[PDB]
């Protein structure tokens, strides 16, 4: 199916406590594969998936050199933004950057992204055409001007449409065991009396990959959206995900309810019932 590669960068200023904290992480789909932490001893880009451990020193030295440059950029950016927004030197502020590329089921380039946020809100983003910029406010219009004159979008377009997707395809092949896999949800249901006249039915999806899943309850075939407790999909720690959906049912009505599970790893959508 479809795939993506994404890098995420966070820098947080630490006035009086040294240089800003910088953390970079890279993903292919829902699988992390590299990290850099400014506060760690190694000062190197590091593997976080087994398939990337096979890349040689030339890859790791190159990623380390580039990630330090991303770090430097954010150090400059924090000072710039502080200036643009007339903020004091005392406060901690956050710059975030994300970029990457999507390929479709044919593995061909589908979409590219490159976006920046300051203190949790949009600052500037490359439009989907990869040729123009969305400036969130008046300060960002200044960055937009600078970047338009320096033809920054042209350089990003060439990466997002080219090397981004070439590397994504390389990773897909080298990590085929990890990345071209699906883990279908293992499902179960639990029943727990919450009083003499009500019971909780909890429908579970465990050990699935990728994270995308749809879990719903029906009563007599009618969707129970506004009556269903749904937790956010959550990582298990081992590369798989979990989720559950619960309904409180009047004792005696258990048979009216069905849980429906949709996931790429299933041969067909599941319908589960308590007896």
């Amino acid at each position: 199916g479809s795939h993506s590669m994404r890098y995420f960068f966070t820098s947080v200023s630490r006035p009086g406590r040294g240089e800003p904290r910088f953390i970079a992480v890279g993903y292919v789909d829902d699988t992390q594969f590299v990290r850099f932490d400014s506060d760690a001893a190694s000062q190197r880009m590091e593997p976080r998936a087994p398939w990337i451990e096979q890349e040689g020193p030339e890859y790791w030295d190159g990623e380390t050199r580039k990630v330090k440059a991303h770090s430097q950029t954010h150090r400059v950016d924090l000072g710039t933004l502080r200036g643009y927004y007339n903020q004091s030197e005392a406060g901690s502020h956050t710059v975030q950057r994300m970029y990457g590329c999507d390929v479709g089921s044919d593995w061909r380039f589908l979409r590219g992204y490159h976006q920046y946020a300051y203190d949790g809100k949009d600052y500037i983003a490359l439009k989907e055409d990869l040729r123009s910029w969305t400036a969130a406010d008046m300060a960002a219009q200044t960055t937009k001007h600078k970047w338009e004159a320096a033809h920054v979008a042209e350089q990003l377009r060439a990466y997002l449409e080219g090397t981004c997707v070439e590397w994504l395809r390389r990773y897909l092949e080298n990590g085929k065991e990890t990345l071209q896999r699906t883990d279908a949800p293992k499902t179960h249901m639990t029943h727990h009396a919450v009083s003499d006249h009500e019971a909780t039915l909890r429908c579970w999806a465990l050990s699935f990959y990728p994270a995308e899943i749809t879990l719903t309850w029906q009563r007599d075939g009618e969707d129970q959206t506004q009556d269903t407790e749904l937790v956010e999909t959550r990582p298990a720690g081992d590369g798989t995900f979990q989720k559950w959906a619960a309904v409180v049912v009047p004792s005696g009505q258990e048979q009216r309810y069905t849980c429906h599970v949709q996931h790429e790893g299933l041969p067909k959508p599941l319908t589960l019932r308590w007896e």
Partner: peptide, 9 residues
């Protein structure tokens, strides 16, 4: 593989 980043805000 990372972009060869150059621009600052």
């Amino acid at each position: 593989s990372l972009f060869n980043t150059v621009a600052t805000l």
